Design an enzyme around this catalytic site. Structure first.
Site, PDB file in Angstrom:
ATOM      1  N   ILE A 181       0.857  -1.214   0.000  1.00 50.08           N
ATOM      2  CA  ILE A 181       0.000   0.000   0.000  1.00 50.08           C
ATOM      3  C   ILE A 181       0.872   1.236   0.000  1.00 50.08           C
ATOM      4  O   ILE A 181       1.666   1.387   0.939  1.00 50.08           O
ATOM      5  CB  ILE A 181      -0.882   0.085   1.271  1.00 50.08           C
ATOM      6  N   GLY A 230       9.085   3.000   1.535  1.00 48.35           N
ATOM      7  CA  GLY A 230       8.931   1.910   2.500  1.00 48.35           C
ATOM      8  C   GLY A 230       8.354   0.613   1.919  1.00 48.35           C
ATOM      9  O   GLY A 230       7.586   0.626   0.948  1.00 48.35           O
ATOM     10  N   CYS A 231       8.746  -0.516   2.520  1.00 43.41           N
ATOM     11  CA  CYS A 231       7.992  -1.779   2.404  1.00 43.41           C
ATOM     12  C   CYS A 231       6.861  -1.710   3.425  1.00 43.41           C
ATOM     13  O   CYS A 231       7.063  -1.791   4.648  1.00 43.41           O
ATOM     14  CB  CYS A 231       8.899  -2.954   2.678  1.00 43.41           C
ATOM     15  SG  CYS A 231      10.512  -2.671   1.909  1.00 43.41           S
ATOM     16  N   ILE A 232       5.672  -1.474   2.918  1.00 42.34           N
ATOM     17  CA  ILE A 232       4.510  -1.285   3.762  1.00 42.34           C
ATOM     18  C   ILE A 232       3.433  -2.096   3.129  1.00 42.34           C
ATOM     19  O   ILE A 232       3.199  -1.957   1.940  1.00 42.34           O
ATOM     20  CB  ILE A 232       4.102   0.190   3.878  1.00 42.34           C
ATOM     21  CG1 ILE A 232       5.295   1.039   4.362  1.00 42.34           C
ATOM     22  CG2 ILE A 232       2.920   0.348   4.801  1.00 42.34           C
ATOM     23  CD1 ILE A 232       4.962   2.518   4.590  1.00 42.34           C
ATOM     24  N   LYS A 264       4.736  -2.074   8.500  1.00 43.50           N
ATOM     25  CA  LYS A 264       5.993  -1.604   7.968  1.00 43.50           C
ATOM     26  C   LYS A 264       7.044  -2.622   8.356  1.00 43.50           C
ATOM     27  O   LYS A 264       7.075  -3.063   9.501  1.00 43.50           O
ATOM     28  CB  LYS A 264       6.386  -0.278   8.564  1.00 43.50           C
ATOM     29  CG  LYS A 264       5.359   0.792   8.320  1.00 43.50           C
ATOM     30  CD  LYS A 264       5.733   2.122   9.003  1.00 43.50           C
ATOM     31  CE  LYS A 264       6.643   2.988   8.170  1.00 43.50           C
ATOM     32  NZ  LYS A 264       6.521   4.442   8.513  1.00 43.50           N
ATOM     33  N   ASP A 304      10.410  17.806   9.819  1.00 45.46           N
ATOM     34  CA  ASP A 304      10.104  17.525   8.357  1.00 45.46           C
ATOM     35  C   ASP A 304       8.562  17.611   7.958  1.00 45.46           C
ATOM     36  O   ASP A 304       8.097  16.806   7.181  1.00 45.46           O
ATOM     37  CB  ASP A 304      10.785  16.174   7.881  1.00 45.46           C
ATOM     38  CG  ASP A 304      11.061  16.130   6.349  1.00 45.46           C
ATOM     39  OD1 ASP A 304      10.738  17.126   5.693  1.00 45.46           O
ATOM     40  OD2 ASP A 304      11.599  15.139   5.809  1.00 45.46           O
TER      41      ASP A 304
HETATM   42  O1  LIG Z   1      -0.727   5.036  -0.227  1.00 46.91           O
HETATM   43  C1  LIG Z   1      -0.408   4.881   0.945  1.00 46.91           C
HETATM   44  C2  LIG Z   1       1.052   4.943   1.342  1.00 46.91           C
HETATM   45  N1  LIG Z   1       1.231   5.417   2.730  1.00 46.91           N
HETATM   46  C3  LIG Z   1       2.266   6.350   3.107  1.00 46.91           C
HETATM   47  C4  LIG Z   1       2.122   7.706   2.812  1.00 46.91           C
HETATM   48  C5  LIG Z   1       3.109   8.596   3.202  1.00 46.91           C
HETATM   49  C6  LIG Z   1       4.224   8.157   3.882  1.00 46.91           C
HETATM   50  C7  LIG Z   1       4.369   6.817   4.176  1.00 46.91           C
HETATM   51  C8  LIG Z   1       3.396   5.907   3.795  1.00 46.91           C
HETATM   52  C9  LIG Z   1       0.302   4.975   3.686  1.00 46.91           C
HETATM   53  N2  LIG Z   1       0.646   4.912   4.971  1.00 46.91           N
HETATM   54  C10 LIG Z   1      -0.277   4.513   5.881  1.00 46.91           C
HETATM   55  N3  LIG Z   1       0.074   4.408   7.211  1.00 46.91           N
HETATM   56  C11 LIG Z   1       1.193   4.910   7.928  1.00 46.91           C
HETATM   57  C12 LIG Z   1       2.351   5.416   7.331  1.00 46.91           C
HETATM   58  C13 LIG Z   1       3.376   5.909   8.116  1.00 46.91           C
HETATM   59  F1  LIG Z   1       4.479   6.386   7.511  1.00 46.91           F
HETATM   60  C14 LIG Z   1       3.318   5.923   9.503  1.00 46.91           C
HETATM   61  O2  LIG Z   1       4.384   6.459  10.228  1.00 46.91           O
HETATM   62  C15 LIG Z   1       2.147   5.404  10.068  1.00 46.91           C
HETATM   63  F2  LIG Z   1       2.016   5.353  11.406  1.00 46.91           F
HETATM   64  C16 LIG Z   1       1.104   4.914   9.316  1.00 46.91           C
HETATM   65  N4  LIG Z   1      -1.534   4.158   5.557  1.00 46.91           N
HETATM   66  C17 LIG Z   1      -1.880   4.194   4.271  1.00 46.91           C
HETATM   67  C18 LIG Z   1      -0.994   4.619   3.294  1.00 46.91           C
HETATM   68  N5  LIG Z   1      -1.328   4.685   1.927  1.00 46.91           N
END
Ligand SMILES: O=C1CN(c2ccccc2)c2nc(Nc3cc(F)c(O)c(F)c3)ncc2N1
Ligand SMILES: [Cl-]
Ligand SMILES: [Cl-]
Length: 317
Positions: free
Chosen positions: A24, A25-27, A47, A153
């Site tokens: 949806i 980083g490797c997330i 993450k 930031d």
């Molecule tokens: O398309 C996207 C990519 N994206 C993202 C956007 C901007 C930056 C990083 C990820 C998302 N991140 C999250 N959760 C999130 C990210 C964090 F970075 C963090 O610290 C935290 F607690 C939660 N949810 C949906 C997301 N959808």
């Protein structure tokens, strides 16, 4: 290199079980363990980074120290907020795969970042939107600062909407956050050898440009620059971002003469007065000084009155 098998069940350090879904980083999307697959409406993400990844460790420590669900809820109740845009920490652990060691962290899932919406609005937010965003960012900054951290930031790509509520904005990404006051001992006016990051050049603080560790005034100054970017589509130094000396020079001179910044950024005789007052108040902070956050919010609240509105929590996106 794939870190998970999709749909596998992972168990965090608290023995809470989660299922992994698509990226949806490797997330990846994540949900509580069940017979169901993890869907595109999953309430969490996972993450995952190598265990030697420094930013994920930094970020995890931030979330463990400051973003425990009940810790946030207590603050919300005591300060009478509608919500607090600090993401919740749901768990973490360690995950080995193919002889490599990973760290994982389970967090709230969010909707869109503000940068996408800003760009879709031809790079403007309205004055109502900017003041409403900024009031909520001031609540977030006050909270993290009171828990010994600065973000260093703030920007629209780090501001995400609640997945189920587009009037609630959250500040994300604490991988390069900075613990400015560990155990109540403020860092001195100097570089930190353990910190390499300078923020994002167009928004970063004069302190950061001067090679000192970020502090509370720097976060508020960053928000200041965001506000102008959002209101106008521009900042004065945006065509010279490859030269940090130039960017610092312009910010220093504009800080010394905020009237000239207002003349540069806004049509003649038509500058929003709360933005100037905000910048003037931030200008008066010493490097170690605690901001009067409520006075800053009052300044922005005077801007909502001026445009015939009020803090009704509507971001108007
Ligand atoms: O398309 C996207 C990519 N994206 C993202 C956007 C901007 C930056 C990083 C990820 C998302 N991140 C999250 N959760 C999130 C990210 C964090 F970075 C963090 O610290 C935290 F607690 C939660 N949810 C949906 C997301 N959808
Ligand atoms: Cl606390
Ligand atoms: Cl333009």
């Amino acid at each position: 290199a794939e870190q998970f098998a999709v749909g596998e069940i992972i168990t965090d350090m608290a023995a809470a079980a989660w299922k992994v879904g698509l990226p949806i980083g490797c997330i990846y999307l994540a949900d509580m363990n069940s017979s169901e697959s993890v869907g595109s409406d999953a309430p969490c993400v996972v993450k995952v980074e190598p265990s030697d990844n420094g930013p994920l460790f930094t970020e995890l420590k931030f979330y463990q120290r400051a973003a425990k669900p009940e810790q946030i809820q207590k603050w919300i109740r005591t300060r009478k907020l509608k919500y607090l845009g600090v993401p919740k920490y749901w768990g973490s652990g360690l995950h080995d795969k193919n002889g490599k060691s990973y760290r994982f962290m389970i967090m709230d899932r969010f909707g869109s970042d503000l940068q996408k919406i800003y760009e879709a609005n031809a790079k403007r937010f309205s004055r109502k939107t900017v003041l409403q965003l900024s009031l909520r960012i001031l609540d977030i900054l006050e909270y993290i600062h009171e828990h010994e951290y600065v973000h260093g930031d703030i920007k629209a790509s780090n501001l995400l909407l609640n997945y189920k509520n587009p009037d609630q904005v959250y500040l994300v990404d604490y991988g390069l956050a900075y613990r400015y006051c560990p155990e109540g001992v403020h860092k001195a006016y100097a570089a930190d050898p353990k910190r390499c990051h300078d923020g994002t050049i167009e928004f970063t603080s004069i302190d950061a440009h001067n090679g000192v560790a970020p502090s509370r005034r720097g976060d508020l100054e960053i928000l200041g620059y965001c506000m102008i970017q959002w209101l106008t589509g521009h900042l004065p130094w945006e065509d010279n971002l490859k030269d940090p000396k130039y960017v610092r020079d312009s910010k220093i001179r504009y800080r010394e003469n905020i009237a000239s910044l207002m003349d540069k950024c806004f049509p003649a005789a038509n500058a929003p007065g709360e933005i100037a007052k905000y910048m003037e108040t931030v200008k008066l902070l010493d490097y170690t000084e605690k901001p009067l956050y409520e006075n800053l919010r009052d300044i922005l609240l005077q801007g909502l009155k001026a445009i015939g509105s009020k803090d009704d929590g509507k971001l108007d996106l």
